[PDB]
Design a binder for this molecule. Structure first.
Ligand SMILES: [N]S(=O)(=O)[C][C][C]C1234B567B89%10B5%11%12B85%13B98%14B%1061B821B326B%1174B%1252C%13%1416[C][C][C]S([N])(=O)=O
Ligand SMILES: [Zn+2]
Length: 257
């Protein structure tokens, strides 16, 4: 099984998923001086007021909070997107120490973590169909730096002890993802891929410029999770990030000057 270790990590993934060496892989380094301001880009529309969270789950690679995506309750629109994208889940990538953890980098700077809110295009009807399409998914990426606590993250942090090991899940209703967003919705965008297997080239990436701050205590709780299942040798769930991949023939566009 793929993972993040020496023998099964990112440098091995191409053997099971040859698209790993494809033309539009993610994440990438965002070179802020080369990204082009595009005045035609619209403001991003984030409509999360009717979001219905369902469960929180340790999937052996991250933890995720899953939403009801059977109706247009929590949707992303505008920005670079055509049409309406339903929120399915959010999850994080993080490091063993604060100087790594993000997938995207900004002028080679790594953040302590990165939040991904994963959305799929309603025109394809279900996420499995959407991953087979070049405009199937839109992932909103938000950097985390360590400093002040993020109050809207605390409800997540506090239940992580109940999903320590792979396969464990818990009820996680009434969680409002608006509490994870920075002030500004200024963003960079580019065409890319899932950053985990199957590495499908189906994502419009929207990466917010403004990080959120989380406390050291909050991120420490992420690092107490385990990659392993209960009863297996304990391996801390840390460094679950894919490094930057070649930009190749792509342009990163900025929504802001
Ligand atoms: N870091 S990331 O790119 O946001 C990966 C998120 C993980 C997934 B996204 B798509 B969305 B779909 B696949 B990918 B994996 B979980 B969430 B949901 C997924 C499982 C199904 C993919 S398949 N195997 O049906 O092609
Ligand atoms: Zn991710």
């Amino acid at each position: 099984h793929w993972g993040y270790g020496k023998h099964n990590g990112p440098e091995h993934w191409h053997k099971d998923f040859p698209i790993a060496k494809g033309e539009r892989q993610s994440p990438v380094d965002i070179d802020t001086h080369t990204a082009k301001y595009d005045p035609s880009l619209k403001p991003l529309s984030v409509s999360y007021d009717q979001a219905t969270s369902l469960r929180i789950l340790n999937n052996g690679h991250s933890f995720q909070v899953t939403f009801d995506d059977s109706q247009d309750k929590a949707v992303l629109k505008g920005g670079p997107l055509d049409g309406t994208y339903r929120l399915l889940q959010f999850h994080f990538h993080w490091g063993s120490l604060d100087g790594q953890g993000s997938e995207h980098t900004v002028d080679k700077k790594k953040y302590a973590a990165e939040l991904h809110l994963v959305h799929w295009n309603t025109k394809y009807g279900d996420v499995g169909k959407a991953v087979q399409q070049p405009d199937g998914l839109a992932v909103l990426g938000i950097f985390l730096k360590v400093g002040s606590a993020k109050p809207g993250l605390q409800k997540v942090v506090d239940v992580l002890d109940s999903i320590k090991t792979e396969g464990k899940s818990a009820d996680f209703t009434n969680f409002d993802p608006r509490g994870l967003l920075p002030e500004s919705l200024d963003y960079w965008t580019y065409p890319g891929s899932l950053t985990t297997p199957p590495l499908a080239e189906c994502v419009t990436w929207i990466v917010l410029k403004e990080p959120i701050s989380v406390s050291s205590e909050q991120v420490l709780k992420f690092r107490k999770l385990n990659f392993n299942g209960e009863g297996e040798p304990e391996e801390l769930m840390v460094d679950n990030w894919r490094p930057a991949q070649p930009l190749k023939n792509r342009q990163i566009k900025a929504s802001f000057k």
